[PDB]
Amino acid sequence: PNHPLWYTLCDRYGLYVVDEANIETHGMVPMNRLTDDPRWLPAMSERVTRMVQRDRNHPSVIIWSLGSESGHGANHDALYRWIKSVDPSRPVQYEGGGADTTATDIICPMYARVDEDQPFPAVPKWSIKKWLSLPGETRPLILCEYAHAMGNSLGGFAKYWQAFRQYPRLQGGFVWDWVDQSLIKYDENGNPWSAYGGDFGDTPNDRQFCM
Amino acid sequence: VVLQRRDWENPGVTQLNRLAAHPPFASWRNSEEARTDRPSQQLRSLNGEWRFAWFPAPEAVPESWLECDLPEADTVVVPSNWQMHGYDAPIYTNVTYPITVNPPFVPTENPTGCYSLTFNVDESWLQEGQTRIIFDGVNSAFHLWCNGRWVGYGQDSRLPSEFDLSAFLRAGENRLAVMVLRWSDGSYLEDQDMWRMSGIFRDVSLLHKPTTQISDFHVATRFNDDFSRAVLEAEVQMCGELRDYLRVTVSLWQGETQVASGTAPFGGEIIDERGGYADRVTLRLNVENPKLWSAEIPNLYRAVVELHTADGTLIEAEACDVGFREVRIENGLLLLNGKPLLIRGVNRHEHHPLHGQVMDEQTMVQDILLMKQNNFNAVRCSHYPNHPLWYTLCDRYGLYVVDEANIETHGMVPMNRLTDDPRWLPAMSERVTRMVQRDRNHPSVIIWSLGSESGHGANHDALYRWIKSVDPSRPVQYEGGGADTTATDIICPMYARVDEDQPFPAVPKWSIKKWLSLPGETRPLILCEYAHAMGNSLGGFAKYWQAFRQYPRLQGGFVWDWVDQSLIKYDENGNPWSAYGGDFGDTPNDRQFCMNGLVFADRTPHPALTEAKHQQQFFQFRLSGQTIEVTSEYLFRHSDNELLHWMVALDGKPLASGEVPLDVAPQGKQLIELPELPQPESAGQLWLTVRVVQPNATAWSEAGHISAWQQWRLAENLSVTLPAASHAIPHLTTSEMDFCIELGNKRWQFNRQSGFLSQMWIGDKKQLLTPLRDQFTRAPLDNDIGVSEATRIDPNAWVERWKAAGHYQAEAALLQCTADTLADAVLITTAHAWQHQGKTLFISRKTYRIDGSGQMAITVDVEVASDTPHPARIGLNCQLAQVAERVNWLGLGPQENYPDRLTAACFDRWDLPLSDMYTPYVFPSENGLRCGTRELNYGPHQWRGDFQFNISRYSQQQLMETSHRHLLHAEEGTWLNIDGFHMGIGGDDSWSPSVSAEFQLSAGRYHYQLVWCQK
Amino acid sequence: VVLQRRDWENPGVTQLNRLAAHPPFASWRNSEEARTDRPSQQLRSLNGEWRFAWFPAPEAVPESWLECDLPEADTVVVPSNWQMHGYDAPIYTNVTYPITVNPPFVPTENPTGCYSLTFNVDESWLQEGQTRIIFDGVNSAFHLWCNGRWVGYGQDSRLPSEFDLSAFLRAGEN
Ligand SMILES: CC(C)S[C@@H]1O[C@H](CO)[C@H](O)[C@H](O)[C@H]1O
Ligand SMILES: CC(C)S[C@@H]1O[C@H](CO)[C@H](O)[C@H](O)[C@H]1O
Ligand SMILES: [Mg+2]
Ligand SMILES: [Mg+2]
Ligand SMILES: [Mg+2]
Ligand code: NA
Ligand code: NA
Ligand code: NA
C-alpha cells in the first residue's frame, strides 16, 4: 500500500489503481513455504484486511491484489475469499503460483510473451494469446508485469499492443516499471552520481537490477 | 512479565512457543508395533495423581509455586475438571455469556487452577532426540513451567497443545507447573450451550521423537468411476537434516497381509519458480478392488509410514487406520462411495455426570454401542473437536462424523460481532486449521464444520475456503447466519420444521421441503439440529422421517441431542440425585435446558430413543394381501445377518408365527408370502407384527438383536354377541347428599353436591381416595413451558396460555345431577361447567349406567369454548386406594407413547411393574401415557373402551409443583388419569409452541365412553 | 518485558495495543470544512525535527532513553529513512533475503533506530475526547513509549499504526 496521498491524487487526476498487500516471500524455497502455512495466516491476513479497511472508499482503486511473488498457498485462497465477501465491488488478482490460480479473477502473468510459450514445469508462462483459450479458461488477461525496461530496452513493445488491440480478452498490462531505483552518492569533489546495488558496500547484492 | 503481559486478554495471542499441529503420533521404533497399533515406549502417559491449588485470580498465585510445591495444595486425579472436585461451582448458561460481554476482557476475579507434577525422565530420552509434552485439553488457557522455567502458553480448550521440553528437562526427577485460567479471550469463542467448567480435562503425555522425524503426513484415497480401483496418496513431511540416504516407505495392510507398498527419497515435485519441497515426499499406492469404508461395513486398512535410511535402518514409524471412501456432493446430493446418504444422526456433547467433561474409553464405547443399536449411523461433534479416541472408535465401529471447530459466539449482539471482525480472524483461524491438521486422516470424519451459532461473518467465508483448498475430500458445512450462506456446502438448518415455515426476519427457518426448491437453490439439506429431545419430547419425529424418505435432497439430520447434561449431587444422607442449572449456586443460569438427551446422563434410555430407533430403521415394509414387501435402505451391504420373525395375534392372543431369512440386496426388495392363517375362533382384531432379528452377534450388538419392526391390522370380526342377561337389578338409595347404588357386594356413591362418583366399595372396602373428576390439564412438559419463567412470562407458551385462561384454577360447577331406575340398571345423569371469571371454559355431560352384571358404563360428552386455548387433555382422574404390583393393558406399548410419538409402540397385551409406568424425567411433568388402549387392568379393576392412560403414585399436582425427580414422594394409593383425548407433546423445538395442528384438541366437541368393572 | 518477549521474532504478534484500521479521518468539527477538504484543527502533523540515535541491536539501547533525551543523539528530519542520513548502508538484493532464512528469527545484529520528540499538547485535548498518534509508515517494526510509559507495538511497514495516547499525555511538554 502507498502513501495515503497517492490515492487522493489518483482519484482527482484519473488513474486506475491496483492496490496491493505488503506481502512478498520471493526468497523462500519453495516460494509458497510461508503462504501455505497456517501459522503465517494471521500475519498475512492483517496485511490484506487492514489495506482494504484503509483504501476501500477510493474510486481510483479498481482491483485488489494479494501481494507479489509468494507462490500460491492456502492462505492466498482464504484471503482472496475474505475480500470477495467484504467488498464485492472490485475484482481480486494475484500472480503467484502460475498467474491463473483459484486466488485470482484475472489471468495476471509477469513477462509472459506474446507468441512464444515458455513451458516451465508447474508454472508455465504461456503465450498470452494461447493462455486465453486454454481448455475451460474464461478470464480476462492483464499482465501484472511486462516489458522489463532495464537499461536499453522495450524491444518488442509494439508486439504487445498489437495483441492487446486485436484480442478482446487481452486487456493490457503494467510495464515494469516507472522509475530507476538509483541512489545519489557524492565523489571526492562533492559531485553527485547515480549508484546501484553494491555501491554502499552492501553484499550480497544484485547490482544494476534495481534500475 | 507473564502476569504483566495478560495474554489471556488479547485475541492476538492464542499461544506462545507451541509446536505445529499434526495427526496422532506415537513415534514407534519398531514397524510391527506400528502395524498392530500396540503401545509405544516413546509415548508416556502423565495421567494420574497431580498437585492442585485453587486461586481467585492469577495475581494471587505465589512465586514460590514456580520452583516449589505448595503444602496447602491437594492431590487430585488428572484429567479432571476442578468444579467436579468442589473447588468452585460449575455454571450452566445457554446463550448469555457467563462473564460480562467486554471483549477481549475477562473478570479480574478469574478462578485460577495451579496444577503441578513431579515425575521421572529416563536418561535415554535426553541423550538424543526430542522430548515434548502434549496437553490434549486445557480449559480455557494456561502458562506452562518446567523446573521453574517458563515454557509457553496455549488457548483453545478442545485441541492438543504441545511444547518442546528438551532444553528444560534433567535426568531423574522433574517438576511441571501449569497455571490454568478459567476465563480468557478464548472464552468469547467458547459460548456453547453446556456446563462451563475448567482445568486439565484431557490426557497429558510425553512424546519422544528423533531429531530427524516425520513431522506430518496426509492420507488421501481416490477412485475410478465404479470404485473397483483406488490410488492411496500419502504426503509425508520431515524435520531435521536433509540427506540423500533418507527414505519413506508407506505400506498398506489388510490384517496381516501387505497389500501395497511404496518407497521414495525426499524431494517433492516442482511447485513454483523456486522449486519444490525438499523436506516432503508423496507416495502413491495402487489398490485393486479396495474394500470400502462405510458406517454399514467399516472396512479398514492399516497404513504404516516408515522413515528410514536407504539400506533399511528404521528411524521411526507412524501409522493410522485407513478407510477407502469418497465423499462428494453431486447434482445436489451428498454421496458416499457414489450413493446418496441418509443421515440418521445425533449431536453428542462430551459429558459424564460424575466426571464432567472428562471422557473415558468405556463411556465412549457405551455411547457408540447404544447409538448403533438404535439405528444411528452418524454423530456431530457438538460443538468442538473431541477427545482423539472418539475418532478412532468411529473409524472402527462405523459412524459418520461431522468434525466441528471450537467456535461459538452465541451471546454476542448481533451473533456475528466477532466473526465478522478481522481482528478475531487469527483466533478463529487457529481453531479451524489446527482441527483439520489433527483429524484429516480419520475416515469417519466425512464433513467439516466451521463451528456453532456465531452468525455469519467474513471470517467464516475465509476459513470455509481455506478448508476447501487444503482438503477437497470433504464438504464444509456451517449453520450460522441462516443455514444457507456462502460458507456452507449443505443447507444445514437447526429446528426447521417439516411443513411449517418460520419466516424470521433475516434468518428464516423455511419448511425443509420448501427450502430445497427456493429459486436458484441446488444444495442437499441435512439438519445440524432437529427434534429437540428435552424431557417428554420427540413429538412429530415420524413426520421428519417420512419427508427424508420421500425427498432425495432431504438427506436426514442430527437429533439434539444424545445425553442429558445432568450432574450428580448428594443429599444430607449421602444419596445421589441429578442436578441441572442453578443447583450449584450458579446464577444467572438456564435451569433444565442443559437436559436435552435421548438418554439420561447414566445412559439409561428416555422413551424417545425407541421412537428414534423405529423411525431410523433400515428396512421398510408394505403389506398387500398375504405378501410382505421388504425394502432395504442399506446402500452397500446385503442383509446377511437378518431374519424376519412374523406373528399374528388376536387382541394379544398368539395365533400363528414363523421365520423367514432376509435376502435383500442394498436398496433391493424381497417378497414374503405368509401361509394361510387359521381364522380366529372368536371376535376381535387380528394384528400382524414383524421384526428383523440379527441371529449373530456383531462388534456393536448381541445375538438376537432386533433392528426393525412394523405392525398392521389384518381381519377384524366385530363382536355382535349380547352379554348374558343377569337376574340381578341394582338398587338405588337416595339422600340429600348422595345417590347410592347397590348390587351384591358392590356399592357406588355419587355426591349430589359435587356431581361426581365420590366412592366405590367392593365388599365394604373403599376403592377411591379422591373422587372421579374430569381433568382438562396436565403437569406441563418442558415443551409446554418453553423459555417461560415466573419473573419473565412468555405469554405465547402453552403453559402460560392455559394459566391465563384459568385452566389450572377453573372450578367445576354442578348444573345437573339426576338418578333414574331402569329395568335392569340405574342411570346417573350429570352436567358440569368449568368457569373462570364469568367465562365458561368447558362443559361436561355424562351418563353412568350401572347394570345387573356389575359393569358401570360411563359416557362423556365435552364442549370446549372455541376461544379458549385448546386443552392439554380431555379425560377423568381419581386416586385409587389400591397400590398393586403390576399393570396389565391391551394397547400401545410397552413404553411411554403420546399421540405424536407412538409409531414405535406396538398394539399387544403388555404387563409391567407399576414403577415402569412412570418415566423419571429429571424435571417432572406429565409422563408415562400409553395410547390406543382398549383394556386396562390394575388390581381388581378393569377399564374398557378406547382411551389413553397413565398410572402412578404421583398426582398431576405434585408433578407440576416439584422441580426435581428426587424430591417426589409416593402418594397414598395410585393416581389414574384416563383420557379420551390427549394433546401432542411436540418438540420441533422447546422454546416456542411446536405441537402440530393435527395433534391439538381443537374439535370443540368430544365424545368418549368407558366401562368400569371388577374382573 | 520488551527485550524479554522479542515480539519481533514472533509472527503471532504483529501488534500490541494497536487501534482498528479505517479510512482517512480528520475529525472536523465544522461541516463546511469537511466538505471543502480544508485543514482540520483536530489533525496535527508531527513531521519535522526529531531526535535520533543509531544502535547495532535493541539490547544496546540504554534505559535512560525512555525518560531522557540522549545527549549523543542527533537532530534529524522525520519522515526519513536512516540509511539516507548515512547511519548505516542501504542494501540492494532482488530475490535472496537480506537476512539468513530462518523464520521467525532475525540477526542478533539488528540495526535499531531510537527516535524521540518533545512536543506540546493543547489543553482542551486533555479535558475531553480521544487523542491518538498515527504512524503512517515505520520500517519494519517498532515499540512506542509516551512520557516513559510503554504504549504499544506494530508491524507492516506500509500501513498506518495508530495508538490511543489519552491516558499517557499530560499538560505541558510530552
Ligand atoms: C528471474 C528473476 C530475475 S525475478 C524478476 O526480477 C525482476 C528484476 O527487475 C523483477 O523484480 C521481477 O518482478 C521478478 O520477477
Ligand atoms: C432460543 C434458544 C432456546 S437457542 C437453542 O437452545 C437450545 C437449548 O437446548 C440449543 O442450545 C440450541 O442449539 C439453540 O439453538
Ligand atoms: Mg489471548
Ligand atoms: Mg448455543
Ligand atoms: Mg512479531
Ligand atoms: Na483487448
Ligand atoms: Na528490479
Ligand atoms: Na432423502
Ligand code: NA
Ligand atoms: Na435464569
Ligand code: NA
Ligand atoms: Na441445551
Ligand code: NA
Ligand atoms: Na414440574
